[PDB]
Design a protein around this ligand. Structure first.
Ligand code: PPR
Ligand code: PPR
Ligand code: PPR
Ligand code: PPR
Ligand code: XYS
Ligand code: XYS
Ligand code: XYS
Ligand code: XYS
Ligand code: CL
Ligand code: CL
Ligand code: CL
Ligand code: CL
Ligand code: MG
Ligand code: MG
Ligand code: MG
Ligand code: MG
Ligand code: NA
Ligand code: NA
Ligand code: NA
Ligand code: NA
Lengths: 283, 283, 283, 283
């Protein structure tokens, strides 16, 4: 099975698929090794790793190349975040085949207007055009197009969020990511209970961590849960602490023991494979 | 003071300068905030973050662009690792002005032969040519060229390591990074005691962590200590643990509390500055 | 004089400054050698060279890196085309310092809305915000910000085109590029005669080639003329003809004599400089 | 048929395959349209277009990304120039899958030592290792690995050039590119007459243009002829002339008529396709 088939199989199978954020190939490799179903090529994580806001500031090329590098490192599906498609439906048409060719198995595109204005979401028909352009542009039918509905977040209400989801599924979306920034899952659970569409839902429970996977498994309508930014957060927490200790201790004499060893990083780098290559071809 | 002046001032001042590894701008920003003197644009860390060996596999462009991005984020000097110069003295000549223009305040270039052969170091005169090409190519005289001597590691002995260091300083090196993979500092300390050159030494005590900064401060001949790969190691240690917990707990309900908050990452991303910009220019 | 000073000197001097399109560093080098005042880092030319439409499809990174490469090759000022700023005023703020750091001496930003809609220009105050963000973001005050007014092209009339130009100059534009796609210069000349602002105008006479430099010199209000796309056009014309001849002749036996020699390209590549470098540093 | 199959079919078919140099996707598109069999992703042409010597100065990433862009534009096979493999057999192993994934249908790798020394070619067994690494690294067996023999050029004689070719074919090369800088084809024709290997030869007759395709068709042992640098040469010849005319005429009033029209470039950019996309998806 190709990665695209694998993701499509997980969605048609009814099993709940988990995807973890990654800001580089090493972190994606660790997510694979930890057992997550797929990698989330998070725009928030990559822009955070560049110390720039997640407000379409980071170059699209930086993100597309990071997706290429991650897909060439892991064997599990990569779901790439393409923000608002980097433009209108015409840009979508030109952009999607690049993400597919980079090896992503899905893209997530949201209906926020872009760029931000000094009215928060684009018109329903305009987004329908963008999703239809994305599905028209993909080569492999198994590649997945996920439409992200921002209407709850934009404060437009549940009726409108469901109306948009249905319009997007009618335009070709393979799944609907309904988002919420509330600190409790009530708004999301009410949307789920009311969702009437045939395609599966996608949740990013970052703001409402109390909704566990067992709680999500109980929602037959959800096929994917995404851990949106826990790798960059974990990284920051530990780097900041090790740096503060090194400066307080005046050195690495204390901190060294606790850290993963240099040998462990060399193994994560594929040293083994490289030695086989040197042994069989360096002459 | 420009960053190049700042680094040159630290070297001429006699104070011991500390530089910490960083594999992205966010980590470089944390090193700055923790109080390190400069950033080490480590080839080992960047290749590890790509999950490829540190054996000249990673594209030079990937590293040069990462240096640009780090220098545009921090206010402290960036010392860039240029491995063996990506080629001979002619490549050095073309490559150095790019690293300088990217905003690096120094480059470290080692005398290993390249590419690796199926004799371990290049000829002394050939490396002298490479260092002279680097110093000839730089525009700002304050930009620093550091020659890294691999002779101890290559097992060529102390006499040869010192002979090479002196030849490189005679060719124009502003400092000599003497390296060692021993688990105790004896080999390095004996080299230091014997070093007769006028330029300062640089140590990367990764393999012999028991040599503390107070121990290094006692070596008047050393002007720089570099923490070679502690950021990627710290990152791996924490990402791996958070991923394993999320998979064991079936969710983020437990791990969320401990992590730095999303709001903390947004602040590290420069959200404040961005709000001032939106407030004064988005109309 | 730095390049930014040189461009500012040409603008304050009253002399008419000429800038020629270039789609790569070699073509920019030829423009310099032909005697043009500066290079026009045309988005139309670079997208045409990629065989994609000039409709914000080409990655911004591809263009920014091409500007870097051109500025590192020529000694004359580079005026970079940044389309609509790749976003709103916030993107402008983040984008301008990158073009400045790449070595461009000016940017040209137009008031078209972006992305294109299924109302043609952005609101006057919104563009004023974008220009003010650009001038706020530049480090060197000599770097030039040129506002391009699309109102004639958008069919909004002369009064509105002048109103926009004046608003942009009031927001900080150092010059106003008034554009026209008419096949005669009447619309442009009438705008010029009516222009009341203090800053100089910029013309791109591509569509009305009969307006010569002597005709433009007679317009004291114009300080810059840009040849918008003549390099890619010339290139296409000759490549297409040589390819057709090679296929008709079944070889290069006939076409070879007419072509510039391989030795001539090697000289344009800086072979001389490289031999001096090899001679003095390859040891 | 995929492009790799198409190239393999041309090689097994006995027909003579023609490939033309291209320094960008537009020029590659013109070569396709002129009727050449494939595109030659020339390192000389791309470095010349950057105004840097063809001496491994140009970044490998710049070339790899240009190959991606060319392959995404044309429908015919792309033969990519990978110089000496950017390193030893280990680099070859890591580099080949990237060129394959970029969409190249073949790579050409030469046996020159690298980097150049202050002995001209690598050891036969070392190159055999590099070619075996390339064939081991490719995913699709149809992808073609071409070994370029520099022994004639290095002045090592015909016996050694043939010995190297045979060793490389024994290591897995699908074809042997025998090169010569002589101004007459005698050296090349004598090598051809003596060539005993089973795989086809590749010629780059740039220096001896009098060897026509009809002359090459008569050499049953040659399966590919490459026009090495005629696109950049044609481009330079015409750009230089148009620039000189514009400066002599003080404008474009005279030169405009002769040039391909702006409308012609817009068509080469895929405007048609883009209008269909806008018409069916921009809503
Ligand atoms: O991870 C991301 O980039 C996301 O799109 C989800 P967020 O908008 O909740 O950060
Ligand atoms: O950090 C690096 O990349 C170094 O050059 C030091 P190392 O060789 O000890 O890893
Ligand atoms: O050369 C360009 O890209 C221009 O902006 C001028 P045009 O819009 O007339 O092509
Ligand atoms: O076109 C190239 O880059 C070639 O490798 C052939 P050359 O070495 O004859 O230029
Ligand atoms: O080669 C891959 C290995 O590295 C890992 O990710 O597990 C699955 C494989 O396909
Ligand atoms: O702007 C910079 C700030 O972000 C920090 O790094 O401290 C020093 C400043 O120059
Ligand atoms: O070095 C430059 C040379 O190459 C040319 O462009 O003329 C001016 C110089 O500054
Ligand atoms: O779409 C392609 C077209 O643009 C051209 O190159 O001819 C063959 C096609 O596959
Ligand atoms: Cl990273
Ligand atoms: Cl990164
Ligand atoms: Cl080009
Ligand atoms: Cl290019
Ligand atoms: Mg996002
Ligand atoms: Mg290193
Ligand atoms: Mg333009
Ligand atoms: Mg070549
Ligand atoms: Na990153
Ligand atoms: Na990284
Ligand atoms: Na180009
Ligand atoms: Na080019």
């Amino acid at each position: 099975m190709t990665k695209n088939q694998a993701l499509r199989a997980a969605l048609d199978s009814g099993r709940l698929f988990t995807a973890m954020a990654a800001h580089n190939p090493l972190v994606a490799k660790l997510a694979e090794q930890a057992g997550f179903g797929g990698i989330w090529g998070s725009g928030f994580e990559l822009s955070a790793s560049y110390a720039v806001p997640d407000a379409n500031i980071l170059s699209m090329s930086t993100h597309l190349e990071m997706m290429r590098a991650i897909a060439s490192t892991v064997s599990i599906p990569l779901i790439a975040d393409i923000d608002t498609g980097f433009g209108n439906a015409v840009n979508v048409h030109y952009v999607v085949p690049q993400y597919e060719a980079a090896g992503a198995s899905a893209i997530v595109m949201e209906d926020k207007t872009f760029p931000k204005d000094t009215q928060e979401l684009v018109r329903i028909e305009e987004f329908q055009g963008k999703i239809a352009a994305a599905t028209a542009a993909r080569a492999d039918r198994d590649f997945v197009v996920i439409a992200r509905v921002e209407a709850l977040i934009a404060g437009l209400g549940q009726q409108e969020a469901v109306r948009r989801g249905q319009a997007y599924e009618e335009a070709g979306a393979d799944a609907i990511l309904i988002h919420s920034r509330q600190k409790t899952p009530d708004e999301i659970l009410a949307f789920v209970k009311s969702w009437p569409g045939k395609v599966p839902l996608v949740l990013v429970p970052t703001a409402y961590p109390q909704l566990t996977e067992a709680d999500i498994a109980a929602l037959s309508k959800v096929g994917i849960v995404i851990y949106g930014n826990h790798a960059i957060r974990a990284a920051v927490g530990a780097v900041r602490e090790v740096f503060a200790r090194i400066r307080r201790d005046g050195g690495i004499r204390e901190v060294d023991a606790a850290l993963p060893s240099v040998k462990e990083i060399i193994e994560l780098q594929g040293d083994e494979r490289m030695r086989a290559v040197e042994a069989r071809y360096l002459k």
